[PDB]
Each structure stands twice: as structure tokens, then as C-alpha cells.
Design a protein around this ligand. Structure first.
Ligand SMILES: *[C@@H]1[C@H](O)[C@@H](O)[C@H](O)[C@@H](COP(=O)(O)O)[C@H]1O
Ligand SMILES: [Cl-]
Length: 463
């Protein structure tokens, strides 16, 4: 009854750090380091040394996902696995052989490989040596890494993404304490945000300069366009939502798609004394090197209100000077996670793409629901009966269909996550998979939602 466009992408998304394990990985990323130093910050003390064992099981995993109707698979290449000497971007031979296994197994199974270059996994040595994303030299080393990827894999990978949710890195590392170095420094946050956007444009330049047979595909970035719904229509609450959009959405969207930063945001940052350092050459690189397409992530809505308190001084600049989170009485909620469920937001994102971002191509690159204690839902056969996940995916997909019918140029849907993976500080507390992973034996077992999504992907339709 709800039919999707021809050649719609169906599959799911993961990342190198959350799936691979550290098996044969030369360097530590920020999270690997963090787990080494403070394991008790991680649920059940599970770090990323093994994660979901994709280092060993990628081939058998893609075979399973092919049998479950997936035509596409998004993961990430780890800078910390592929590169030996960061300053020269020399190649670790085992990492190269590893990403060649991943990509070749994708194609052998008829799965389009979709490759992200950064998913919260800066090398710790670049943080220690230079301040990480605070450094424009680090940005250059990221570019050199991206060039290795395009040269080595671009004959077979035609679908590239520079970052996953760069504002999450900015917030995690420099505002809200959920990535390492977990410091609170707005001036740094703002410069990191500029540097991530500049890195996006430089990687795009590098991709497009590659040999023609390695540069004929598409390159984008993965962003959030989650609306910041105002608590009310008061002037105050609207101005709160307005600023929350400027920061959380517009900064990276305007730079990715239109090659400019939003002027209003710039005036706020300048007034507050925290505007990034830029050069005219960097700004022209950004204007000239914009995305072919986007991934847009959605997995819960955000609401905001006018700030409850105006501090006479703050410890550091924060976007939350201009808004607070708001909880809407009567919202639908996922109790394990403390997150509102509001699938209508997918339609709103679709309409925004249509009307404000020239309807360029985009896909919903991460959509899923995470639950603990899924043991409780196994039936007689031992299969997890995750009808809550079927229902969640079905609703969000229904609103994606509504957006495509209204004219939004959406070309795909990726479930977070094909197989249970390691979610950072929460490790395996909450499971998002269509397919269960036993984290002690690394044995997989499809859940009911895997067979439901198989049907949807294979018939190219819902209901
Ligand atoms: C999106 C993100 O890209 C992915 O890495 C995370 O695993 C998921 C789920 O988050 P939690 O594990 O915090 O629930 C999204 O945040
Ligand atoms: Cl983002």
C-alpha cells in the first residue's frame, strides 16, 4: 500500500568503532583511550576492544544482511586503523587489507557500500599533540587520510560521507561532557565547529580532484535537521527555538549545502566574543566545495523554551545561554532511554529539505530505537519479538513516505543498527539491532524486526 521510489536504499548503519573491535588496530581513538583510563564510566565495564567483532565477522554479517533484504550498508573507516604515520598519512597494511575485505564483501553480496570517514574517532595522539579538531594542522592530516581512502577504495566505493554528526563531536568533546576530553569550553567548541566544516569542504575538494575513475561518485556529510520545537508561540519561546535551530541545524547545513555560515549566527558569536578564526581563502574553499547529497539522522525530537535563568556570568559560552530543553506534558516516550517518540518530525525534516535546501538529494541515515533487557521478549523459539521496534520503524517510515509524496527528494532509509553494537558510554545497555548479538560469544540471531524489514526492503513498500 505505501510504495517507495525505485532504487531506494534499504539497509542499516553502524561505525568502525562501534562494530569492529580493536583487533589489529594500530592506534587508539578518543573512545579507546577513554575506556583505557576510566572503564567504570562504561556500562557493565564493556569497552570497545571487541565490540561486535566485525573485524572477524564482516563477511558473514554482510551475507546475513543480504539474506535479510539489505541493498546498502553504511559504516566508517577508522583513521586509527588505516593510517600508520599520521603526519605523512602512510598506510597500515593490515588496515588497508581490512577495509578491502569490507568493501569487497559488500559488492560480492550486492550491497552498495556507503562509507563515512569520521564517527567520533579522532586519534588520541592528535588530540595530545595538537588539540585535535582545535587544530587546522589536524584538519590537514584528516584530508591526507581522506585522500588515502579515495585512492585505495574509490574504484569500488562511490558513496562517501565526511563526518557523522559533527555538532555531536563539538558538544560531546567541548560543551556537555560525553566525549573525551569532556571539557567545557565554548570558545573552543565554536572553533572546532568551524574547523569541522572547513574539513568537510577540504575533503570534498580532495575527493573531486582525484583521478576520474575514483572521483565519479558522490560525497556528502551526515547531519541533524531535527526541529527545535518551541514550547509555545510566545515571542520568548520562539526566539529560543530560533536560536537553537541556528546553532544545532543551520551552522553545518548552511555550510554543507550553500557553502556559507548563517549570518545571524555569526553576529551572535561575534557579539558574545567567541567567533571562530577564519581566513578569506578558507571561506572561499567552503563556498566552492559543497555536498552532492546528505545523510540526515533522526532518532528523537528536541523541544526548547526560553531560558529559565539568565546567569550574571557563565563559566564558558554555551548555545544554552539562549534556550533550555523543554518537556511537553503528554509526550509519547521510550522509558528505558528517557526519549520522546515523535515520528512526525521526519515529515518536518523532509519538508525543510524540500523548501529550504533546494530539495537536494538526502537519505534518512540513522533511525532506530534502543531498549534494554531484550531477553524479556524472547518467545518459545528464542527469537526476540521486538514488536516495539517494528512499530517504531513503521511509523517513522510512514512519515518518510508522506514526505516523499509531498515532493521531498529522499532516496533511502538506513536503520540504526543492523546488528547490536557498542554505543559509547552506554556500551550494550540499550540494543538497537534488527539482529541480536550475544556480546560474550559474538553469535548473531535475527530478531522479529529483521524479518519485517526484509519484507519492506524486498517488496519496496509498507503495510
Ligand atoms: C546515532 C549515532 O550516530 C550512533 O553512533 C549511536 O549509537 C546512536 C544511538 O545512540 P545511543 O547509543 O546513545 O542510544 C545515535 O546516537
Ligand atoms: Cl550534526
Amino acid at each position: 500500500m505505501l510504495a517507495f521510489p525505485k532504487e531506494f536504499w534499504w539497509g542499516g548503519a553502524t561505525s568502525g568503532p562501534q562494530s569492529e573491535g580493536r583487533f589489529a588496530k594500530q592506534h587508539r581513538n578518543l573512545f579507546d583511550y577513554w575506556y583505557e583510563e576510566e572503564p567504570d564510566l562504561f556500562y557493565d565495564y564493556v569497552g570497545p576492544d571487541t565490540a561486535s567483532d566485525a573485524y572477524h565477522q564482516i563477511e558473514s554479517d554482510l551475507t546475513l544482511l543480504a539474506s535479510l533484504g539489505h541493498n546498502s550498508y553504511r559504516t566508517s573507516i577508522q583513521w586509527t586503523r588505516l593510517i600508520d604515520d599520521f603526519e605523512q598519512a602512510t598506510i597500515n597494511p593490515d588496515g588497508l587489507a581490512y577495509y578491502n575485505r569490507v568493501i569487497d564483501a559488500c559488492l560480492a553480496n550486492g550491497i552498495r557500500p556507503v562509507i563515512n570517514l569520521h564517527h567520533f574517532d579522532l586519534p588520541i595522539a592528535l588530540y595530545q599533540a595538537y588539540g585535535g579538531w582545535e587544530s587546522k594542522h589536524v584538519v590537514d592530516l584528516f584530508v591526507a587520510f581522506s585522500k588515502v581512502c579515495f585512492e585505495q577504495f574509490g574504484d569500488r566505493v562511490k558513496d562517501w560521507f565526511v563526518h557523522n554528526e559533527p555538532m555531536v563531536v563539538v558538544e560531546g568533546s567541548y560543551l556537555m561532557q560525553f566525549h573525551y576530553p569532556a571539557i567545557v569550553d565554548g570558545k573552543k567548541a565554536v572553533q572546532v565547529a568551524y574547523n569541522l566544516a572547513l574539513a568537510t569542504a577540504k575533503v570534498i575538494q580532495a575527493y573531486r580532484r582525484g583521478p576520474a575513475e575514483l572521483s565519479d561518485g558522490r560525497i556528502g556529510t551526515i547531519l541533524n535537521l531535527t526541529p527545535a520545537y518551541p514550547a509555545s508561540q510566545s515571542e520568548a519561546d520562539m526566539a529560543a527555538a530560533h536560536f537553537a535551530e541556528l546553532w544545532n541545524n543551520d551552522l553545518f547545513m548552511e555550510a554543507a549545502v550553500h557553502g556559507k555560515f548563517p549570518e545571524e549566527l555569526v553576529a551572535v558569536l561575534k557579539k558574545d566574543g567567541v567567533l571562530w578564526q577564519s581566513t578569506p581563502e578558507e571561506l572561499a574553499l567552503i563556498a566552492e566545495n559543497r555536498v552532492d547529497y546528505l545523510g540526515l539522522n533522526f532518532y528523537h525530537p528536541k523541544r526548547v523554551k526560553a531560558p529559565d535563568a539568565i546567569p550574571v556570568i557563565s563559566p564558558s559560552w554555551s548555545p544554552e545561554w539562549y534556550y533550555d530543553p523543554y518537556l511537553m506534558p503528554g509526550h509519547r516516550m521510550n522509558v528505558d532511554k528517557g526519549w520522546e517518540i515523535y515520528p512526525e518530525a521526519v515529515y518536518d525534516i523532509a519538508i525543510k529539505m524540500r523548501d529550504h535546501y533546494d530539495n537536494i538529494p538526502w537519505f534518512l541515515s540513522e533511525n532506530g530505537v534502543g531498549i534494554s533487557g531484550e531477553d524479556r521478549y524472547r518467545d518459545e523459539t528464542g527469537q526476540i519479538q521486538d514488536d516495539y521496534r517494528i512499530q517504531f520503524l513503521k511509523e517513522h517510515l510512514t512519515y518518510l513516505h508522506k514526505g516523499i509524496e509531498a515532493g521531498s527528494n529522499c532516496f533511502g532509509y538506513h536503520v540504526w543498527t543492523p546488528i547490536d553494537g557498542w554505543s559509547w558510554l552506554n556500551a550494550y545497555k540499550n540494543r538497537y539491532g534488527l539482529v541480536e548479538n550475544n556480546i560474550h560469544t559474538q553469535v548473531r540471531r535475527p530478531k522479529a524486526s529483521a524479518y519485517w524489514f526484509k519484507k519492506v526492503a524486498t517488496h519496496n513498500r509498507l503495510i
